Structures are given as structure tokens and as C-alpha cells.
RNA sequence: AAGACGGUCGAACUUGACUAUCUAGAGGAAGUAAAAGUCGUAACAAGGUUUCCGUAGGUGAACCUGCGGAAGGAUCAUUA
RNA sequence: GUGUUCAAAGCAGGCCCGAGCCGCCUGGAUACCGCAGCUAGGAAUAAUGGAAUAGGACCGCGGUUCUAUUUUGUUGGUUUU
RNA sequence: CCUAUCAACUUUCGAUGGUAGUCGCCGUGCCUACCAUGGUGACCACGGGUGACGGGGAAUCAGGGUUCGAUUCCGGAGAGGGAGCCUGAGAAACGGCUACCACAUCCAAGGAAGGCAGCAGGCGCGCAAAUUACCCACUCCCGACCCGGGGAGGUAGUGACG
């Protein structure tokens, strides 16, 4: 499905997330909201998995898992 | 020696050999799939990852040197591994989030040299061959 | 799946004794449905353009057939992959040449010209002799020809001169010991010889001890023995390669001696 | 107690021969022992033997010679179809120029050279050279 | 033998039926209509029991419509429990070339036992023959129950 | 023809239960590596209390002790 | 077996005639089949066979009773064999 | 093939058998009445696992063995997942159908049409794998037919597997 990720840093880009979400199955694509007028990575991302099982697994784990000294928040989009 | 050898004892020999086969360390690790589960090689031969950070390692005695490794999270396997960076003054060209192709060392499944927790070596930096950079056949594109 | 029977057969999966190539063509001719089973058959095409070499395309083969210059068993065929078999006579009406198919003891189908006298009839062994409906008797030959009102003393494994001008039985030859036989299929392929003894076993599979002309003795199943006439009285000639049995050493001596000695 | 009788006899002779001793008492004595001894004797590997008769099971005194180097037993017996005979012969004999593998065939207890001519296989008893 | 009025339906054999003709009353057989018997060949003879019979079994190849074709096997009766079936244990050799001895193996097979065989017991050597599947497990039918030495009660004085 | 009676095959759905596989996690307690720091001196020569086994209890710790063993002890050897 | 220039391979080919010789001719062997099953020769080896308060052989024979069909033309009854 | 840190298992929604019937292209607990209480296991059943399709075959080994088999051929199986069906001798068919479920598409919002584990190609995935090409002339297949159609198949291109 599509899952939303929030509480991203501006030092956390698509590439940093790409390796992070591989133990929860292979991502199809990682879209990340950027605005270059203010900041870099706004704070919201949308990761798109190919399969429904893989997507749900991510939401469960990643929520409570630390990455760059912040608690990532993941939830169904 | 110490085995049965009658005229009907085929079954007993056949099963006894199978039962004892499992004891051996080299056999057991591979057949229980342990090798895949713990180490990222076994069920792959090469693997590409993204560079997490560049590490300096103040090598454990014997031998006094700074060994210098990179830490890589492999995309396919999803495991974090510290891998040696070979070649002279070649640490330099690695950059955080710049990838590398990692491969096993030579002991296979176990630590090499004077340094524990490293059993893998980098082969390409920037996916364009560390070897080619060291020789100066090819340039660093990144 | 598999929702029905194949209409194709690949080459390099076809029976060896048709003498096709290996992988240089990816499809074999495949016999049509007919009076004989596809293993033992010889599609018309293989005879016409691979042995007698009258075509170098498939386009020509179709065009040849449509001329209708070819009768097979006295009757006018036009099938491109006709399922001819054992002692089936091919009649070219444009040249007056009659060819019959009989095994070499090498195991290769023989190109065996016969006179139009011997192409009048063929000897067919009875497969079943049948009391049909409303108490009319019939004999059924191996090549699935049912002839009504047959001679009223015949019994199993008799041979029967079938005539191809007019159909029907044109006498018969009674099955007896010492009759000529050609043993077809197996490890005894294309050997000719008498009988000697037919051993009978109740229940399935009865073996027939054969002695060949050379004096080599062997058994095969009754199924693999085909009766081709009366003992020491051929009705068609021996084919090339003896048709009896020859050793690999003798065969080499013939191959080298005849070659570069003709022309 | 004794689950093979060949194995005891063969050892007994060899152990005597090592000493230089020219007598043994083998027992329980069987038909196969007699037959093995005669074939062995004929080729000159051992000397003559004498069977003493008792109602126990018999006892044989073999007068041996040191023309033998080893008489081995193939226990448990194996089938030999004349295309494992070749494999045995290269494996377990020092040359193909001498030594006999002795088998039991339906055409009698015989040396393997005779077996090869008959083309009758059977069960392998042992060997000597 | 056993009656066919034991169940709740009377049976007949093919083309054996009552003509009672002009004369009063039966048949009304005195053996429940003529008992038809036939051979099965392959070195077996129909016994007295077939002829004596009138039983509701029809899986018998001497009174039934079943045909015996194929393999003829032998086995030892490992179990007799309930009526009209027995279990035979069929010993066979499985050949091993890889080890230079080979191993016995067995299978137990449920097999129909006709009421054309009686005075039978466990331990009996029996000769069974192949048939079309009679019931889900049972492909075979007892053609002859042999008695046979190695079993004794053959040293007697009565 | 829609429709419709009753049945059979039966996808799917809903509510409880179950197991497997995977993953988050405050904290707790181990073993390993990890190295030249802190406190003892345990075993190694009878290591200055010979060692060690089973078992129970005790000692900050190595460890000690009772009870029965073993020698792989330091005894292959003690008597008219 | 065979002259793909060697070779990986392929199953081909080689001759005689000016091109009316309206042509001659060799081939694409043979070997292999987990097993089990089928056939058949052997009888060593390993198991296996029986007659004990008797049993097996040879129309050895009797008195008693039964049933099936040959036959006394045919068919029925009685009596045997 | 591996497993006992799987030792008892199979029927109340038949487990095995007898009898009789319904049903099926046809055998048969296939299904059902009635009636029996069976059937199977230490010779490993039962249960669990499995990048477990099977064979012909492949690689290395003195011999013995060990390892491999989706993959040019043969058999079976499936065509997004399930279930049902029509046509026809043969199909429970995705370049047929119908429903639902998971996916995707058009929409004027009422509706409507769909299945590349076909050939090319693209996306995703990864350490990993090619032309959106040309042709029915060959080799064969199909048809009412020599005549037509064929991503069967041939042909080139890509190609330091080797």
C-alpha cells in the first residue's frame, strides 16, 4: 500500500530511509516532501511499498524505533 | 572401526551415517541455514549497500596500526556490517551515502587478521572499482 | 495442464529408425491418424524427399501430393504425412515403380523396389478374427482392414493375401511351425527366420523361440513376431544389409570395400 | 560363539605361519572349510591336511607351508556378477599376475579364473596369494 | 451356506431365476435356486465351498462377476479381525547397491476374504490375485488359502 | 423471457478462538571479545593447606569445609 | 563409420560420365538401464521341506452308500457296471 | 529430502469393511441408508519442515563415492487469487465466460470494459540477464486449403556464461 512517515530530519533524505526500510521488505519508491525555500526535508514523506504485507510490517516496527536521535512516526496513509 | 556389517544391516548403516553427519561445525552451519541468517554472504556472493559512516579503528594487538574501516548497511540483506577498506590511502574516496560494493574476505563467516568484527572487504567505491581508483586507470566520478 | 492431445511433434523426440537428423530442424513430420501406430510409421514426406529426394522444400511436397500421381495400397492418396507401415506398398504411377517398406536388420527402413506382380498383394497377419453382429464373421488384419465373410477354417496368427485391386481375401496361408517370420521391433529388429517352437504361457505374454537363417537362436514376444508367409517360401525379396543379421566387424568390411570402388 | 568359521581357520593358519609352527587345530570343521583347504592346497599355498573325526563336529589338523602371504576373508559375503570381480581384483590383490579370489558359485566352490570361464558368479568367500 | 435373507433384500445370480411353470407352488428353491459356479483359471480350481454356497458375496471370482487379471502375489495373514476382510503382510526385498548388503521391507495390505474360504486363521499363508478395485483400500481378492509345511500339525496320530 | 419453489456445489463476508512467522520495547541478568586499570593469592615444585569427584552448607572473591570416593600424588615399598 | 581446411561440432559422403554415365554407390554402428516384474539354466552358498501314541507310496482289496453322464436307435422307469 | 525439543494415529461432518441404492464417461465410501468395528505405526507411521516439480540427464571422484537437475527433450501442474459454468469428441480454458476477493483502467457519474509465469518493451527488485527490429522463404502446425495465417518457428541485433 502507501504508508506515511513523519518526524523526518533535514539530514534524513530518501537515501537514508531507503536502507532503513529494507528489513521490512523492499520498497517500490520513496517520495519525500521537499521545499528548498525553507529548509530541505519538510518533515513528511510517503513511502510506497509494492505489497500489502511489507507495508504493514514497516508501520508496526519503525514506530518506536530510533533513527538520528528521534522517534520516527509511521502510520497508514 | 566399530560398525555393524551383517546381511540386512543396510538400514542401520544408512541412518547412522546421516545422524553423525550433523556434528561437524562446517556441515551444521550451512545446512541449518545459519550462514544466511547471521552473515549476509552464503546465499549471496556480492552485495551493494549504502555507507553509514567512516570508522577509524585503532587495531587490536598484535600489530600497531590504525586499520580504518567503513560501516555499510547492505540494501539486499538489510544487515549492518563493518568492512575493511584495502589499498593505500584509499579510505579517502569513501563518503557517507555514496555506496560501496562489499564482498566477503577469505576466512568465510569468521574474522580475519588482527581485527575482530570485520570479515568483509570493500571492492568498489562509487560502484566504479576501488582498484581502478588506486591504479589511476579511472577517476572518482563523485 | 494439458487440455487435449498434441497436434505437433518435435524432432529429437521422434523414433530413431525413421532416420531423421538431430537438432538442425526443430519439428519432425509426425504421422497422421490412420491404420498403424505412430511409432512404427514412416510419414510419406521422409520417404519422398529424404530418401528419394524429389523435393528440397516443404512447398514442393504439397504440390507433388496434389498431382495425385501417388497411390498407396492401390488407392489414391494426397496426404502429406501418410502413415505407411510394414509391407505397405507405395505405387508411383508416373514412372511405374512400386516400393515396399520392410526393415533392414541394421534397423533402417529399406527402399525396396518390387515388381508390379508383387505389388498386387501384400501378406497381412490377422490380429483378431471376430464373430461380428448378427452372426456374420469377419477377419481383422493388423492394418485395420476388416474383410467380411472370410475363409471358414482360419485361426489366429494366420496370414492372408489381401489384394489391392479389388480388396478382399485372395486365398490365405495357414499358420504352422517353421513359417517365415520377420521379427520387428526390439533387439531383434529386422531379422528374418523360421519359428522352431512357440512356447505358450497361460496369462499375459507368450514368447516364441525363433531361429534365424544364420543359426543364431533367440526368443521374443509373440507380439514382436510378424508372420510374412510360408516356411522357406518368400513372397518378397530380402532387403539390403542382408536382412538376416550381420556383425559390426563384417559390416565395417563391407562399408570400406564397396566405397571408392563404384563409379 | 562362532558366527563365521572361515575367519577363524584363516587367522589360525597365518598365526602359526608367523611362528614357523607347522600345525594348527581348527574346528568346528565344515564342508566349506574342506573345500577351501583343497583349492588352497592344490596351488601349493599350504601343505596337506588331515581331518580327524569326532561326533562333536570334527577337528582338522593342517600342516602348513610358508608359501602363503595372506589368506583374507570377505565377511560379510557380497555378490559378484563378474563386473565387480575386476574391481575387487585391482583393489585387494597386489597384481593381476598371481593370487586367486575364491568364490562359491552354483557350479561349485572355485577360483575366480575358472569362474570367469564359466561366467557363473555367486558369493565371494575370500582370497589368497 | 449362509442365507441371503439375513440382510433385508433377497438376491439372485445372473440368469438364474424362478420358472415355476404350470405346476403349483415353487420354485421356492431347495438351495435358493441352482448354485452356479465357474472357474477362474491360472492353476486354480473352484472348491466345494463355491458349489455349497448361496452367500450374498459377489466379490468371489467363482460365483461373482469380478474378473481376476494381473499379478498374483502371496502373503502371510498378519490380522484377521472383522468379517469378509483380512490383512496380509507382504514381505519383499528392496535392493541396495550402495551398501553391499540390502534390506527387507514390508507393507500391510487389506484384502477381501470371500466366504468361499472358511476354516481359516491368522498365520495362514494365502495366495491373492489382482482385480479391479473392489473397495477403497482393497484391490485384491483371496484366490486360494494354502496349507503348507513349515506350519505343521502334520505330525499326528489321529 | 423476467420472476419464482426447494436443493446441491460454494466464492466471500461477520464474530470469537488458534498457531506459525516477523518486528517495536522501559528494564533485568548472563557469557564472549576487549589487552597491560583496582583488590586479594586460588591452582602450577608437596605452590608452602597435595589435587580433584559426587553432594550439602558456608566464605566479598579466588575458595573452604563435612561426609564417602579417585590418583591423573608427593606413595607401584614395610616387616618374626 | 565419415577428410566440418585443424577443431568445438555435423551426420554426412565418395566416385565416374564432355554436360546424353540421361549414371554407380557406402552410411547415420554398437553399448548402457534405480528397482521390482516377466523368461530360463544351475544347485554350491544362506535359509526352507517332513513319519512319534503313524504316515506316505503301488488300480494292493473288500463290504456300505452317493452323485454325474456315456451307452442297450430315440425318450422315460427300474439294476448294475 | 530432513526431523522424536514430532510416538501413537484415523470417523461424528466416513476413519476401514459388509450389504443395497443414488450418482458418474466408467471401477470405488464417489455419495447415502442400514449393519459391522475396523484400518495404520519403532521395518518411523502420524505430525512438522522444505528456493520439494519429477525423469532422461549434468559436474567432480583411482575405485568406492559426493554433489546437481526451473532451464533446448519427455510427463505432470498453473496462467492475479478463489469458486462456478458454456461450447465441444476433448477445456472447469484468462490473447472464453460469470460471480466474488485482491489489483488496475475509462467515466459526462448513469455506467462500461481488463489480466505479458505469450513475443518484444517498461516499472519495481536485485550481485544478476539482450531488439519496443525483419520475415513466413526454411522447419512444421492449422483451415474449406499447394495458394492463406503463425512473436510456433526462422533471421539479424545485443552477447569475454562458456
From Swiss-Prot, chain A:
Molecular function terms, GO-annotated: RNA binding; translation initiation factor activity
RRM domain location is 1-77
The organism's superkingdom is given as Eukaryota
Q: Which positions carry Phosphoserine?
A: 26
PTM comment: Phosphorylated. Phosphorylation is enhanced upon serum stimulation.
Question: Tell me, which GO biological process terms does this entry list?
Answer: formation of cytoplasmic translation initiation complex; translational initiation; viral translational termination-reinitiation
Q: Which UniProt keywords apply?
A: Cytoplasm, Initiation factor, Nucleus, Phosphoprotein, Protein biosynthesis, RNA-binding
Where does the protein end up? Cytoplasm; Nucleus; Cytoplasm, Perinuclear region
Q: Which family does it belong to?
A: Belongs to the eIF-3 subunit G family.
Q: What do we know about how this protein assembles, alone or with others?
A: Component of the eukaryotic translation initiation factor 3 (eIF-3) complex, which is composed of 13 subunits: EIF3A, EIF3B, EIF3C, EIF3D, EIF3E, EIF3F, EIF3G, EIF3H, EIF3I, EIF3J, EIF3K, EIF3L and EIF3M. The eIF-3 complex appears to include 3 stable modules: module A is composed of EIF3A, EIF3B, EIF3G and EIF3I; module B is composed of EIF3F, EIF3H, and EIF3M; and module C is composed of EIF3C, EIF3D, EIF3E, EIF3K and EIF3L. EIF3C of module C binds EIF3B of module A and EIF3H of module B, thereby linking the three modules. EIF3J is a labile subunit that binds to the eIF-3 complex via EIF3B.
Q: What is this protein called?
A: Eukaryotic translation initiation factor 3 subunit G
Gene expressing this chain = EIF3G
Curated annotation (Swiss-Prot), chain C:
User: What terms describe the molecular function in GO for this protein?
Assistant: rRNA binding; structural constituent of ribosome
Q: Which ranges carry the S4 RNA-binding domain? A: 42-104
Q: Name one Pfam family in it.
A: 40S_S4_C
Entry keyword Zinc: no
Task: List localization entries.
Answer: Cytoplasm; Nucleus, Nucleolus
Q: Which InterPro entries match?
A: KOW, Rib_uL2_dom2, Ribosomal_eS4, Ribosomal_eS4_C, Ribosomal_eS4_central_region, Ribosomal_eS4_central_sf, Ribosomal_eS4_KOW, Ribosomal_eS4_N
Name a GO CC annotation attached to this entry: cytosolic ribosome
- Cross-linked residues for Glycyl lysine isopeptide (Lys-Gly) (interchain with G-Cter in SUMO2) are 230
Q: Which SMART domains does the protein's record reference?
A: S4
Note the CDD domains from the entry: KOW_RPS4 (cd06087), S4 (cd00165)
N6-acetyllysine modifications at: 233
BP GO terms, sorted: translation
Recorded coiled-coil stretches: none
Q: PROSITE patterns given for it?
A: RIBOSOMAL_S4E, S4
Q: What are the protein's UniProt keywords?
A: Acetylation, Cytoplasm, Isopeptide bond, Nucleus, Ribonucleoprotein, Ribosomal protein, RNA-binding, rRNA-binding, Ubl conjugation
Write out the function statement from the record.
Component of the small ribosomal subunit. The ribosome is a large ribonucleoprotein complex responsible for the synthesis of proteins in the cell. Part of the small subunit (SSU) processome, first precursor of the small eukaryotic ribosomal subunit. During the assembly of the SSU processome in the nucleolus, many ribosome biogenesis factors, an RNA chaperone and ribosomal proteins associate with the nascent pre-rRNA and work in concert to generate RNA folding, modifications, rearrangements and cleavage as well as targeted degradation of pre-ribosomal RNA by the RNA exosome.
Family membership noted in the UniProt record: Belongs to the eukaryotic ribosomal protein eS4 family.
- Please give the name of this protein: Small ribosomal subunit protein eS4
Organism of origin is Oryctolagus cuniculus
Tell me the gene name. Answer: RPS4X
UniProtKB/Swiss-Prot annotation, chain D:
The organism sits in which domain of life?
A: Eukaryota
UniProt key word Cytoplasm: yes
Please provide, alphabetically and separated by semicolons, the GO molecular function terms listed in this UniProt record.
Answer: structural constituent of ribosome
Q: Does the keyword Cytoplasm apply?
A: yes
**Where does it primarily localize?**
cytoplasm
Q: Show the GO cellular component annotation of the record.
A: cytosolic ribosome; nucleolus; ribonucleoprotein complex
SUPFAM superfamilies tied to this protein: Ribosomal protein S8 (SSF56047)
Q: List the coiled-coil residues.
A: none
Q: Which UniProt keywords apply?
A: Cytoplasm, Nucleus, Ribonucleoprotein, Ribosomal protein
Give the GO biological process terms. translation
User: Which residues are modified to N6-succinyllysine?
Assistant: 87
Q: Where in the cell is it found?
A: Cytoplasm; Nucleus, Nucleolus
Its assembly, as annotated, is: Component of the 40S ribosomal subunit. Part of the small subunit (SSU) processome, composed of more than 70 proteins and the RNA chaperone small nucleolar RNA (snoRNA) U3.
Write out the function statement from the record: Component of the small ribosomal subunit. Part of the small subunit (SSU) processome, first precursor of the small eukaryotic ribosomal subunit. During the assembly of the SSU processome in the nucleolus, many ribosome biogenesis factors, an RNA chaperone and ribosomal proteins associate with the nascent pre-rRNA and work in concert to generate RNA folding, modifications, rearrangements and cleavage as well as targeted degradation of pre-ribosomal RNA by the RNA exosome. Required for proper erythropoiesis.
Q: Which family does it belong to?
A: Belongs to the universal ribosomal protein uS8 family.
* Name of the protein this chain belongs to: Small ribosomal subunit protein uS8
Which organism is this protein's natural source? Oryctolagus cuniculus (Rabbit)
UniProtKB/Swiss-Prot annotation, chain E:
Q: InterPro entries in the record, alphabetically?
A: NA-bd_OB-fold, Ribosomal_uS17, Ribosomal_uS17_arc/euk, Ribosomal_uS17_CS, Ribosomal_uS17_N
Task: List modified residues, type Phosphoserine.
Answer: 67, 110
What subcellular compartments does it reside in? Cytoplasm; Nucleus, Nucleolus
Query: Where are the Omega-N-methylarginine modifications?
Result: 69
List residues, modification N-acetylalanine.
2
Q: What positions are modified (Citrulline)?
A: 22
The molecular function terms of the Gene Ontology recorded here are: rRNA binding; structural constituent of ribosome
Q: Which residues carry this modification: N6-acetyllysine?
A: 38, 45, 58
Subunit and interaction comment: Component of the small ribosomal subunit. Part of the small subunit (SSU) processome, composed of more than 70 proteins and the RNA chaperone small nucleolar RNA (snoRNA) U3.
**Its family?**
Belongs to the universal ribosomal protein uS17 family.
The molecule here is called: Small ribosomal subunit protein uS17
Q: Which organism is it from?
A: Oryctolagus cuniculus (Rabbit)
Amino acid at each position: 500500500a502507501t504508508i506515511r512517515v513523519t518526524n523526518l530530519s533535514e539530514d534524513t533524505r530518501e537515501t537514508d530511509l531507503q536502507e532503513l526500510f529494507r528489513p521490512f521488505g523492499s520498497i517500490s519508491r520513496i517520495y519525500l516532501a521537499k521545499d528548498k525555500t525553507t529548509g530541505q526535508s519538510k518533515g513528511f514523506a510517503f513511502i510506497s511499498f509494492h505489497r500489502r504485507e511489507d507495508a504493514a510490517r514497516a508501520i508496526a516496527g519503525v514506530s518506536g524505533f530510533g533513527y538520528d536521535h528521534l522517534i520516527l512516526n509511521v502510520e497508514w496513509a | 572401526m566399530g560398525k555393524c556389517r551383517g546381511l540386512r544391516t543396510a538400514r542401520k548403516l544408512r541412518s547412522h551415517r546421516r545422524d553423525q553427519k550433523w556434528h561437524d561445525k562446517q556441515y551444521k552451519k550451512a545446512h541449518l541455514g545459519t550462514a544466511l541468517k547471521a552473515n549476509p554472504f552464503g546465499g549471496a556472493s556480492h552485495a551493494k549497500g549504502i555507507v553509514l559512516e567512516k570508522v577509524g579503528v585503532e587495531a587490536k594487538q598484535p600489530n600497531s596500526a590504525i586499520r580504518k574501516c567503513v560501516r555499510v548497511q547492505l540494501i539486499k540483506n538489510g544487515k549492518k556490517i563493518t568492512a575493511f577498506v584495502p589499498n593505500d590511502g584509499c579510505l579517502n574516496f569513501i563518503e557517507e551515502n555514496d555506496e560501496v560494493l562489499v564482498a566477503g574476505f577469505g576466512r568465510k563467516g569468521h574474522a580475519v587478521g588482527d581485527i575482530p568484527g570485520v570479515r568483509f572487504k570493500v571492492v568498489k567505491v562509487a560502484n566504479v572499482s576501488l582498484l581502478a581508483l588506486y591504479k589511476g586507470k579511472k577517476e572518482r566520478p563523485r | 495442464m494439458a487440455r487435449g492431445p498434441k497436434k505437433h511433434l518435435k524432432r529429437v523426440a521422434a523414433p530413431k529408425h525413421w532416420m531423421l537428423d538431430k537438432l538442425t530442424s526443430v519439428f519432425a513430420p509426425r504421422p497422421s491418424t490412420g491404420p498403424h501406430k505412430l511409432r512404427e510409421c514412416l510419414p510419406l514426406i521422409i520417404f519422398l524427399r529424404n530418401k528419394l529426394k524429389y523435393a528440397l522444400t516443404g512447398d514442393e511436397v504439397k504440390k507433388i501430393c496434389m498431382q495425385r500421381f501417388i497411390k498407396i495400397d492401390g488407392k489414391v492418396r494426397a496426404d502429406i504425412t501418410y502413415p505407411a507401415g510394414f509391407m505397405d506398398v507405395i505405387s508411383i504411377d508416373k514412372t511405374g515403380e512400386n516400393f515396399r517398406l520392410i526393415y533392414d536388420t541394421k534397423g533402417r527402413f529399406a527402399v525396396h523396389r518390387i515388381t508390379p506382380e508383387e505389388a498386387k498383394y501384400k501378406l497381412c497377419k490377422v490380429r483378431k478374427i471376430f464373430v461380428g453382429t448378427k452372426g456374420i464373421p469377419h477377419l481383422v488384419t493388423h492394418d485395420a482392414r476388416t474383410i467380411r465373410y472370410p475363409d471358414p477354417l482360419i485361426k489366429m496368427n494366420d496370414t492372408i493375401q489381401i489384394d489391392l485391386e479389388t480388396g478382399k481375401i485372395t486365398d490365405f496361408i495357414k499358420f504352422d511351425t517353421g513359417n517365415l517370420c520377420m521379427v520387428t521391433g526390439g533387439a531383434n529388429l529386422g531379422r528374418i527366420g523360421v519359428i522352431t517352437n512357440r512356447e505358450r504361457h497361460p496369462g499375459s505374454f507368450d514368447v516364441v523361440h525363433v531361429k534365424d537363417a544364420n543359426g543364431n537362436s533367440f526368443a521374443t514376444r509373440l507380439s514382436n513376431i510378424f508372420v510374412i508367409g510360408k516356411g522357406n517360401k518368400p513372397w518378397i525379396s530380402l532387403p539390403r544389409g542382408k536382412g538376416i543379421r550381420l556383425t559390426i566387424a563384417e559390416e565395417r568390411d563391407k562399408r570400406l570395400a564397396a566405397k571408392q570402388s563404384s563409379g | 560363539v562362532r558366527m563365521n568359521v572361515l575367519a577363524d581357520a584363516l587367522k589360525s593358519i597365518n598365526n602359526a605361519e608367523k611362528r614357523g609352527k607347522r600345525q594348527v587345530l581348527i574346528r568346528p570343521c565344515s564342508k566349506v572349510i574342506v573345500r577351501f583347504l583343497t583349492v588352497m592346497m592344490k596351488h601349493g599355498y599350504i601343505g596337506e591336511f588331515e581331518i580327524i573325526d569326532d561326533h562333536r563336529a570334527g577337528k582338522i589338523v593342517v600342516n602348513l607351508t610358508g608359501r602363503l602371504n595372506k589368506c583374507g576373508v570377505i565377511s560379510p559375503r557380497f555378490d559378484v556378477q563378474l563386473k565387480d570381480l575386476e574391481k575387487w581384483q585391482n583393489n585387494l590383490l597386489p597384481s593381476r599376475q598371481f593370487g586367486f579370489i575364491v568364490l562359491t558359485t552354483s557350479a561349485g566352490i572355485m577360483d575366480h579364473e575358472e569362474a570367469r570361464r564359466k561366467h557363473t558368479g555367486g558369493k565371494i568367500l575370500g582370497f589368497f596369494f | 451356506m449362509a442365507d441371503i435373507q439375513t440382510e433385508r433384500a433377497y438376491q439372485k445370480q445372473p440368469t438364474i431365476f424362478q420358472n415355476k411353470k404350470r405346476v403349483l407352488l415353487g420354485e421356492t428353491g431347495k438351495e435358493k435356486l441352482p448354485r452356479y459356479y465357474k472357474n477362474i483359471g491360472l492353476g486354480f480350481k473352484t472348491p466345494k465351498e463355491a458349489i455349497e454356497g448361496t452367500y450374498i458375496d459377489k466379490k468371489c471370482p467363482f460365483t461373482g462377476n469380478v474378473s481376476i487379471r494381473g499379478r498374483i502375489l502371496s502373503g502371510v495373514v498378519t490380522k484377521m479381525k472383522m468379517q469378509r476382510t483380512i490383512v496380509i503382510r507382504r514381505d519383499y526385498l528392496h535392493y541396495i547397491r550402495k551398501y553391499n548388503r540390502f534390506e527387507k521391507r514390508h507393507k500391510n495390505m487389506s484384502v477381501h476374504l470371500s466366504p468361499c474360504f472358511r476354516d481359516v486363521q491368522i498365520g495362514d499363508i494365502v495366495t491373492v490375485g489382482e482385480c479391479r478395485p473392489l473397495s477403497k483400500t482393497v484391490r485384491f481378492n483371496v484366490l486360494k488359502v494354502t496349507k503348507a509345511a513349515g506350519t505343521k500339525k502334520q505330525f499326528q496320530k489321529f
